[PDB]
Nucleic acid binder design. Structure first.
Length: 79
DNA sequence: TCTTTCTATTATGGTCATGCTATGGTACATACATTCACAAATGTATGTAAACGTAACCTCTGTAAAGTCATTAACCTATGGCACGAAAAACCAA
């Protein structure tokens, strides 16, 4: 959490000074960190999505749809 | 001793189904050990030879049962010879 907050403050200061997106190559050149570590820290940090997420205007389109369970295998393979 | 005027939860359907997914940040300094990841050695492992025995297995001579053909004589068409029963001639009675 400390490293994520430090990289967020450095990215905010870099977007304030430069004026474009915080490309991680300049962060790796500044904080002397390897680039794959910066990719890993930027990839892990993400908040999960809730199980309802109202998409449409009507109360018919919610979750419990488009998500499948891969444990239940095919009946043809069992046959 | 008793009926109205207010303060809060339930309720009305789903079937035919839709697209594109995140939204603002807010400190570091010692610390000691659990865990991942490689060196190097054990141990049982697998795959290459070599010996015995019978899975046998064809080859050949002897015993045995089955088609056929030597006898020999039983019956059977022939031949000769003698009864036999039919067909015609004869003669008698009415």
């Amino acid at each position: 959490i400390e490293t994520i907050n430090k990289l967020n403050r450095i990215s905010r200061q870099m977007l304030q000074e430069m004026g474009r997106e915080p490309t991680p190559e300049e962060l790796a050149e500044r904080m002397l960190m390897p680039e794959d570590k910066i990719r890993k820290v930027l990839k892990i940090a993400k908040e999960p999505i809730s199980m309802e997420t109202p998409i449409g205007d009507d109360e018919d389109s919610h979750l419990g749809d488009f998500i499948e369970d891969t444990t239940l295998e095919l009946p043809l393979d069992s046959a």
